[PDB]
Amino acid sequence: EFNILLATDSYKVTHYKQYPPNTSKVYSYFECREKKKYEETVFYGLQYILNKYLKGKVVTKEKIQEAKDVYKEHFQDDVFNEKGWNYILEKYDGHLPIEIKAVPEGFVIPRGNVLFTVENTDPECYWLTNWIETILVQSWYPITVATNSREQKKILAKYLLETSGNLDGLEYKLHDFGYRGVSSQETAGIGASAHLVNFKGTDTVAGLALIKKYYGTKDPVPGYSVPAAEHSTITAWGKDHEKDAFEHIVTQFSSVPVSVVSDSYDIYNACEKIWGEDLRHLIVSRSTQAPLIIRPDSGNPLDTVLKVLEILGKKFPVTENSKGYKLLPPYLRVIQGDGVDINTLQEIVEGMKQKMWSIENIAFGSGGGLLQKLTRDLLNCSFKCSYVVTNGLGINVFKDPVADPNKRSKKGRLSLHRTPAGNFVTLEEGKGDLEEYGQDLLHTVFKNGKVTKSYSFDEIRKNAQLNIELEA
Amino acid sequence: EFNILLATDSYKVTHYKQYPPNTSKVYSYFECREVKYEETVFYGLQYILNKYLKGKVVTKEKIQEAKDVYKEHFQDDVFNEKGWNYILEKYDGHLPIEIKAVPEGFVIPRGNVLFTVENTDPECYWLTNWIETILVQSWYPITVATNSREQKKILAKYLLETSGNLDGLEYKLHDFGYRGVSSQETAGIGASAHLVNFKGTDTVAGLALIKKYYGTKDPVPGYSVPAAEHSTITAWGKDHEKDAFEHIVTQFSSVPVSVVSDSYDIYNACEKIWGEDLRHLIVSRSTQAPLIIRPDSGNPLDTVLKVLEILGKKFPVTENSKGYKLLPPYLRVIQGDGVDINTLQEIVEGMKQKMWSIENIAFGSGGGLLQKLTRDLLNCSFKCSYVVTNGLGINVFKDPVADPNKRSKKGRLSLHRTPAGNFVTLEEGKGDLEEYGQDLLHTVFKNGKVTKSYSFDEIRKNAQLNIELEA
Numbered sequence: 002e003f004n005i006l007l008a009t010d011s012y013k014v015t016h017y018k019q020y021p022p023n024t025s026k027v028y029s030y031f032e033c034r035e036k037k038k039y040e041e042t043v044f045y046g047l048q049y050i051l052n053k054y055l056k057g058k059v060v061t062k063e064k065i066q067e068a069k070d071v072y073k074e075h076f077q078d079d080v081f082n083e084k085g086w087n088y089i090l091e092k093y094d095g096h097l098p099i100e101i102k103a104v105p106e107g108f109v110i111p112r113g114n115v116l117f118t119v120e121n122t123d124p125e126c127y128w129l130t131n132w133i134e135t136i137l138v139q140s141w142y143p144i145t146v147a148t149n150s151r152e153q154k155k156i157l158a159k160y161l162l163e164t165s166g167n168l169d170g171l172e173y174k175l176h177d178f179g180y181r182g183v184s185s186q187e188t189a190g191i192g193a194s195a196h197l198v199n200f201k202g203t204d205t206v207a208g209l210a211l212i213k214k215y216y217g218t219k220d221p222v223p224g225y226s227v228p229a230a231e232h233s234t235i236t237a238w239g240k241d242h243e244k245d246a247f248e249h250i251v252t253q254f255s256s257v258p259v260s261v262v263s264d265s266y267d268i269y270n271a272c273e274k275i276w277g278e279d280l281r282h283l284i285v286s287r288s289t290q291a292p293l294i295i296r297p298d299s300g301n302p303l304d305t306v307l308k309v310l311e312i313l314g315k316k317f318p319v320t321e322n323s324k325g326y327k328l329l330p331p332y333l334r335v336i337q338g339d340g341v342d343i344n345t346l347q348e349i350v351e352g353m354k355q356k357m358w359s360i361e362n363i364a365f366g367s368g369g370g371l372l373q374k375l376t377r378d379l380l381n382c383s384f385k386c387s388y389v390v391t392n393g394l395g396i397n398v399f400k401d402p403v404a405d406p407n408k409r410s411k412k413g414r415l416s417l418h419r420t421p422a423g424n425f426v427t428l429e430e431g432k433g434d435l436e437e438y439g440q441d442l443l444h445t446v447f448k449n450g451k452v453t454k455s456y457s458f459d460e461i462r463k464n465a466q467l468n469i470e471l472e473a
Numbered sequence: 474e475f476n477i478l479l480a481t482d483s484y485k486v487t488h489y490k491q492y493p494p495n496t497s498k499v500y501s502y503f504e505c506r507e508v509k510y511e512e513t514v515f516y517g518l519q520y521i522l523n524k525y526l527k528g529k530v531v532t533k534e535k536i537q538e539a540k541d542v543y544k545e546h547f548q549d550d551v552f553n554e555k556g557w558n559y560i561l562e563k564y565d566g567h568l569p570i571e572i573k574a575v576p577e578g579f580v581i582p583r584g585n586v587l588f589t590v591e592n593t594d595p596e597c598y599w600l601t602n603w604i605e606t607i608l609v610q611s612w613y614p615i616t617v618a619t620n621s622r623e624q625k626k627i628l629a630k631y632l633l634e635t636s637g638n639l640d641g642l643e644y645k646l647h648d649f650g651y652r653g654v655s656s657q658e659t660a661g662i663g664a665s666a667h668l669v670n671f672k673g674t675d676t677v678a679g680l681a682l683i684k685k686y687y688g689t690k691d692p693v694p695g696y697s698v699p700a701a702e703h704s705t706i707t708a709w710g711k712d713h714e715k716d717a718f719e720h721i722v723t724q725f726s727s728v729p730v731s732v733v734s735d736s737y738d739i740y741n742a743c744e745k746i747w748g749e750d751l752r753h754l755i756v757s758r759s760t761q762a763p764l765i766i767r768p769d770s771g772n773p774l775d776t777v778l779k780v781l782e783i784l785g786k787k788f789p790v791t792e793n794s795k796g797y798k799l800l801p802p803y804l805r806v807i808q809g810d811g812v813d814i815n816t817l818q819e820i821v822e823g824m825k826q827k828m829w830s831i832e833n834i835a836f837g838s839g840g841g842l843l844q845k846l847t848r849d850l851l852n853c854s855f856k857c858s859y860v861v862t863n864g865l866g867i868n869v870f871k872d873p874v875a876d877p878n879k880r881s882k883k884g885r886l887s888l889h890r891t892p893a894g895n896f897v898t899l900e901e902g903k904g905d906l907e908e909y910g911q912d913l914l915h916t917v918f919k920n921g922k923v924t925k926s927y928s929f930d931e932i933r934k935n936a937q938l939n940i941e942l943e944a
């Protein structure tokens with residue numbers, strides 16, 4: 002069973018001895034620190050952590066004993082606030098005397114802004130605020146995935162609109178392949194859910210269950226996929242029978258969309274001779290709602306995509322759309338799911354546009370780039386103490402390293418406000434109390450062991466919409 | 474509760490309809506295909522076998538659940554209920570799979586077979602690649618273990634060169650990555666992969682993972698000392714940084730203590746506060762309880778050098794037998810900001826050029842150690858190499874025309890020792906020819922049971938550095 006007493010950085014066990022004596026309050030905030038190409042971030046992930054890890058009765062005398070035994074050996078010393086954790090168990094039945102205020106999930110906030118704040122509600126548990134820093138900072142991941150996925154959606158949106166004239170099927174042009182590419186099962190469910198904030202196409206099944214029990218949707222499921230092949234289902238037929246494999250699969254799924262990886266041996270031969278000639282008759286007859294999706298999986302991503310399209314363009318009836326861009330027959334589409342991140346995605350669509358190919362021809366797939374190739378450095382997701390009450394007197398606290406002004410933190414009690422021009426501003430030193438701005442956009446989401454404010458996954462999706470999507 | 478029927482890439486649900494008819498055997502393998510990472514530490518599989526694969530993993534509830542989810546997920550019913558119902562009825566929910574693997578901890582050069590997977594029942598031909606996704610995630614404990622070990626080599630070389638020994642080596646790369654990872658489960662897995670090479674960690678979660686799935690003779694596989702964060706310094710007010718330092722070192726006067734000293738001015742705190750104001754509280758400390766000074770900002774190498782040059786002028790510096798300068802035993806340094814395998818090399822090299830010994834310093838790494846790693850780093854890949862259809866086996870493989878590096882091995886594989894004592898993977902079942910001695914892989918899993926396991930002690934012994942093997 003999970004133990005919150007064991008879910009922190011080791012040195013934080015010794016921190017209750019290091020704060021100024023007569024300290025009754027520790028107040029900390031969380032921000033995606035400004036780096037003086039991601040200027041706005043999607044706040045998502047906190048609600049999962051609150052329900053799964055922080056709420057209810059998270060302390061028992063057993064959990065205190067087990068933490069005591071481990072830390073004795075880990076430190077080779079008795080340094081462990083057993084009294085402190087005992088107080089929480091007896092006074093609050095193991096519930097955390099903590100209040101967390103947060104911006105609503107899905108919200109797209111510029112960087113340098115407070116996203117949530119953490120403070121203890123009991124003077125005795127001043128140490129508790131930063132004990133749970135490690136666990137809360139791990140929200141850097143869903144936030145980073147949601148943000149990075151959304152930025153890729155912006156790029157897709159821009160190029161789709163410019164070459165097709167609309168945004169039809171935009172939410173299905175970036176498919177989640179990264180289930181095997183992540184560091185664990187729990188990460189998989191978390192990362193996939195952050196992607197579904199922006200798109201509807203996923204293969205990482207784990208994200209479906211997470212959303213259902215922690216956020217919920219009106220629809221049965223927030224993500225979808227189609228029957229598709231891997232290299233094993235092709236290669237198993239023997240190197241001489243790739244056509245037999247191709248034909249078997251497209252016939253098995255003759256009435257639904259189907260994707261077939263075609264680069265096992267020679268991607269350019271499979272498109273030109275096999276799909277293009279041998280099995281062309283099984284393709285042209287396919288329904289509009291059930292196209293063949295050809296899938297290259299190797300080589301230079303941009304060069305391979307063009308050449309694939311160029312091959313298919315001469316084997317199949319291509320039409321020029323109203324915007325002047327070339328379009329495959331509706332029974333034929335392409336998915337590029339190899340070596341795609343935000344960088345390469347930009348190069349492909351721009352490459353496709355230069356060659357007059359429409360983005361409606363292609364959807365993308367991303368694995369490690371989508372879910373794993375991300376760090377806390379990217380958005381500078383940081384958790385810092387800004388306000389402390391000692392001897393009844395409150396002071397504004399901050400860090401400001403001489404050799405890195407970028408790492409400077411904010412002072413005092415914070416609040417998030419809408420500017421007169423409709424932008425965002427973070428007020429420091431408790432200046433938000435002056436009422437010179439609107440109401441604090443942060444909402445109490447957690448207090449004294451109970452989640453006080455929840456958001457459906459439907460709301461989070463609505464909040465994180467792109468601007469061009471609102472413009473429709 | 475976990476459900477293995479829901480723990481695979483979606484499209485694999487449709488794969489049982491794609492293999493050649495009358496296929497009875499699907500046999501697949503795993504490899505680190507193809508800064509250089511020429512050899513990898515195999516570690517992590519045993520966790521996945523125990524936590525996720527062994528025992529009754531299939532029930533009538535889990536089948537119905539997967540039935541319901543996939544129906545909405547595909548907007549159609551393509552889920553193989555009959556196949557999973559066969560497992561439940563015939564084997565009481567136990568997976569008819571056999572997995573052979575190189576012993577955990579082993580350091581194997583790239584391009585070799587690390588483990589293989591195959592079905593043990595003709596009916597469950599489709600089962601082999603169903604569990605691809607879950608098994609491929611071993612890429613992460615393997616990569617962390619490998620990258621952590623590679624960094625250990627770097628520290629070993631420069632420590633031995635500047636100090637003459639390897640004392641304190643397994644404590645010179647501390648885990649700070651707990652907050653820097655994507656989840657709790659990852660933290661435990663990543664930290665345990667780190668603990669294969671080192672003993673210094675702050676990621677608590679890894680300790681319990683090891684005890685449950687691997688086990689050690691010692692109570693714990695990892696250790697830590699009391700230390701400060703920015704909040705325990707800055708909470709005293711900017712005008713009272715000296716008061717915080719003094720309070721902290723006084724609380725932990727008899728145990729090792731580390732104090733982050735860059736809240737405002739790293740070079741001021743080192744020269745004026747530690748070096749003048751509180752100098753009397755430092756030189757009195759025990760050799761078993763040194764003050765550890767922790768910078769946490771600026772250019773990593775430049776900061777470390779200037780810090781050391783400052784302390785060397787405020788404190789009695791000694792020159793060891795190898796001619797390298799050394800702080801007094803009650804004073805050390807830890808650099809835990811911006812440290813990865815690349816920067817770690819630059820720092821120790823920069824220290825050596827400035828005649829500073831590596832014994833003066835330990836390192837802390839967070840994202841670089843646990844998070845900034847991907848599956849393509851060691852090209853960790855899982856591929857089918859052998860199937861039996863119509864009673865006839867065939868050697869299958871991929872070979873993309875535009876990428877020879879994605880070529881996959883053919884036929885039944887085996888791992889052998891070369892006459893010169895190296896590793897070789899034999900393909901096309903040529904291991905049966907007995908020309909290369911016995912197969913080095915062991916059956917670790919069969920029909921729902923872990924059949925061979927290793928202690929964390931064995932793994933550590935297996936993962937030792939050749940320099941450590943020398944004496």
Ligand SMILES: N#CN/C(=N\CCCCCCOc1ccc(Cl)cc1)Nc1ccncc1
Pocket residue numbers: 173174176177178179180201202203204225226227228229230258260261294296336338364366368482483484
């Ligand atoms: N193609 C492939 N691959 C794959 N699944 C199939 C993805 C299907 C994407 C099809 C295009 O978008 C759509 C997604 C959903 C819907 Cl309703 C319609 C269209 N899964 C992998 C591959 C590689 N690694 C892991 C999983």
Ligand SMILES: N#CN/C(=N\CCCCCCOc1ccc(Cl)cc1)Nc1ccncc1
Pocket residue numbers: 010011012641644645647648649650673675697698699700701731732765767805806807809831832833834835837839
């Ligand atoms: N100090 C710090 N950091 C921290 N706690 C304590 C870790 C223990 C470090 C022990 C270092 O022993 C040494 C050993 C040998 C030498 Cl020559 C110098 C030092 N944990 C963090 C920090 C930042 N972020 C996450 C965790």
